[PDB]
Design a protein around this ligand. Sequence first.
Ligand SMILES: *SC1=NC(C)(C)N(O)C1(C)C
Ligand SMILES: [Cl-]
Ligand SMILES: [Cl-]
Ligand SMILES: [Cl-]
Ligand SMILES: [K+]
Length: 164
Amino acid sequence: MNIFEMLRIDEGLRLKIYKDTEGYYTIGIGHLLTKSPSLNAAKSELDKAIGRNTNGVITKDEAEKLFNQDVDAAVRGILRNAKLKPVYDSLDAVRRAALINMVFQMGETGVAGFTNSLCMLQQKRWDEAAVNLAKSRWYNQTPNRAKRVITTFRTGTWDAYKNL
Ligand SMILES: *SC1=NC(C)(C)N(O)C1(C)C
Ligand SMILES: [Cl-]
Ligand SMILES: [Cl-]
Ligand SMILES: [Cl-]
Ligand SMILES: [K+]
């Protein structure tokens, strides 16, 4: 297991434009296209992202290319954020993947708002951090995924992704 395999489990793979858990047009391995309700706007974002006229369908190689860019962008967002970088630097590699996962799903600004959870993680108070992380819209709206990510923070193991 690693961050790519973990997010591939959590996000799935679909080669046509679909709506994510929030209703937003998405493609590939969780590549958010736009929050606009216009499918035409989403198709324009897709063509710009891929570099060709796609009409809403991409190949697996193209999906994996966007996915690698998106994982890279999540890490870069962590490293450039004054609240996320110290927590990231303090963590082992397994728990770093859990933080990347959250940033991939909700963005740098959203995760940086988990001020109290981040402090408990930096303090390595793993059970307390896990309890605090679940007191969130994130957990309530995507509880099965949040439980996997939280277990990863709590234990520093890949146990929540093993049977998947
Ligand atoms: S985050 C944060 N809050 C307190 C003041 C408890 N800290 O020492 C951190 C970990 C920098
Ligand atoms: Cl709490
Ligand atoms: Cl709550
Ligand atoms: Cl879920
Ligand atoms: K998804």
